[PDB]
Design a protein around this motif. Structure first.
Motif, PDB file in Angstrom:
ATOM      1  N   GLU B  44      36.233 -18.161  35.542  1.00 47.40           N
ATOM      2  CA  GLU B  44      35.662 -17.063  36.321  1.00 47.40           C
ATOM      3  C   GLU B  44      36.457 -16.879  37.601  1.00 47.40           C
ATOM      4  O   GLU B  44      36.795 -15.752  37.982  1.00 47.40           O
ATOM      5  CB  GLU B  44      34.189 -17.354  36.618  1.00 47.40           C
ATOM      6  CG  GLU B  44      33.327 -16.135  36.965  1.00 47.40           C
ATOM      7  CD  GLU B  44      32.936 -15.322  35.745  1.00 47.40           C
ATOM      8  OE1 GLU B  44      31.828 -15.555  35.184  1.00 47.40           O
ATOM      9  OE2 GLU B  44      33.755 -14.456  35.351  1.00 47.40           O
ATOM     10  N   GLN B  45      36.839 -17.992  38.230  1.00 46.64           N
ATOM     11  CA  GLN B  45      37.630 -17.932  39.456  1.00 46.64           C
ATOM     12  C   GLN B  45      38.947 -17.227  39.226  1.00 46.64           C
ATOM     13  O   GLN B  45      39.340 -16.347  39.996  1.00 46.64           O
ATOM     14  CB  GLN B  45      37.856 -19.347  39.995  1.00 46.64           C
ATOM     15  CG  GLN B  45      38.601 -19.394  41.311  1.00 46.64           C
ATOM     16  CD  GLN B  45      37.763 -18.907  42.482  1.00 46.64           C
ATOM     17  OE1 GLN B  45      36.763 -19.530  42.848  1.00 46.64           O
ATOM     18  NE2 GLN B  45      38.176 -17.782  43.078  1.00 46.64           N
ATOM     19  N   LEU B  47      39.785 -15.108  36.852  1.00 50.15           N
ATOM     20  CA  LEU B  47      39.736 -13.753  36.342  1.00 50.15           C
ATOM     21  C   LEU B  47      39.051 -12.785  37.296  1.00 50.15           C
ATOM     22  O   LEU B  47      39.262 -11.575  37.174  1.00 50.15           O
ATOM     23  CB  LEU B  47      39.057 -13.752  34.970  1.00 50.15           C
ATOM     24  CG  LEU B  47      39.887 -14.474  33.862  1.00 50.15           C
ATOM     25  CD1 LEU B  47      39.350 -14.190  32.469  1.00 50.15           C
ATOM     26  CD2 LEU B  47      41.350 -14.086  33.948  1.00 50.15           C
ATOM     27  N   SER B  48      38.320 -13.295  38.282  1.00 49.47           N
ATOM     28  CA  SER B  48      37.566 -12.466  39.219  1.00 49.47           C
ATOM     29  C   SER B  48      38.491 -11.586  40.055  1.00 49.47           C
ATOM     30  O   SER B  48      39.659 -11.891  40.264  1.00 49.47           O
ATOM     31  CB  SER B  48      36.731 -13.338  40.168  1.00 49.47           C
ATOM     32  OG  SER B  48      37.572 -14.086  41.021  1.00 49.47           O
ATOM     33  N   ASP B  49      37.910 -10.509  40.597  1.00 44.92           N
ATOM     34  CA  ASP B  49      38.633  -9.424  41.248  1.00 44.92           C
ATOM     35  C   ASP B  49      38.065  -9.228  42.643  1.00 44.92           C
ATOM     36  O   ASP B  49      37.104  -8.466  42.832  1.00 44.92           O
ATOM     37  CB  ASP B  49      38.488  -8.143  40.443  1.00 44.92           C
ATOM     38  CG  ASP B  49      39.097  -8.248  39.069  1.00 44.92           C
ATOM     39  OD1 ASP B  49      40.338  -8.236  39.005  1.00 44.92           O
ATOM     40  OD2 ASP B  49      38.340  -8.346  38.075  1.00 44.92           O
TER      41      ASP B  49
END
Ligand code: ZN
Lengths: 89, 95
Positions: B44-45, B47-49
């Motif tokens: 998640e870290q 791929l997060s935006d």
């Protein structure tokens, strides 16, 4: 007609949602195929992509030799010319 | 062993800029998670935006894809808000 409804909230939705938080769910609902999740999640901006790969490398380094080997495996599968470059073939 | 547990990573350091330029991380985080060297948080870290302009574009692309699936995509999208964005779920359902 249900989607034409939500159009009024499009800017709020696109402002709040971090898509990687919900694409795994949507994929499991079978409304997102792998080509779909790719377009959503890919980073065509080099500046952003470099940052994220850097964070990925940072996480893998904390796993030591295990992450290194697994990382090389992934390049041999997905980035074969890169794999040869960094491994000297 | 010129790539032992301590040194292997420093060895790649010379290739860092090229690695970070070529790799699209979402193409390999699924693999790496299956190798058990990435946990779900970690992914998640990566791929997060954190950039709004980028995140907005991606959600818009995601909405357009989902709309092409019709009512089934609408129901799934709404369920995903109920779970992961409850306040936004309330907002769009009028509550
Ligand atoms: Zn409908």
């Amino acid at each position: 007609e249900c989607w034409s409804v939500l159009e009024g909230f499009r800017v709020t939705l696109t402002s709040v949602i971090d898509p990687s938080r919900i694409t795994p769910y949507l994929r499991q609902c079978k409304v997102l195929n792998p080509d779909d999740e790719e377009q959503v999640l890919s980073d065509p901006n080099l500046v952003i992509r470099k940052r994220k790969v850097g964070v990925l490398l940072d996480i893998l380094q904390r796993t030591g030799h295990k992450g290194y080997v697994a990382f090389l495996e992934s390049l041999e599968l997905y980035y074969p010319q890169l794999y040869k470059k960094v491994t000297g073939k």
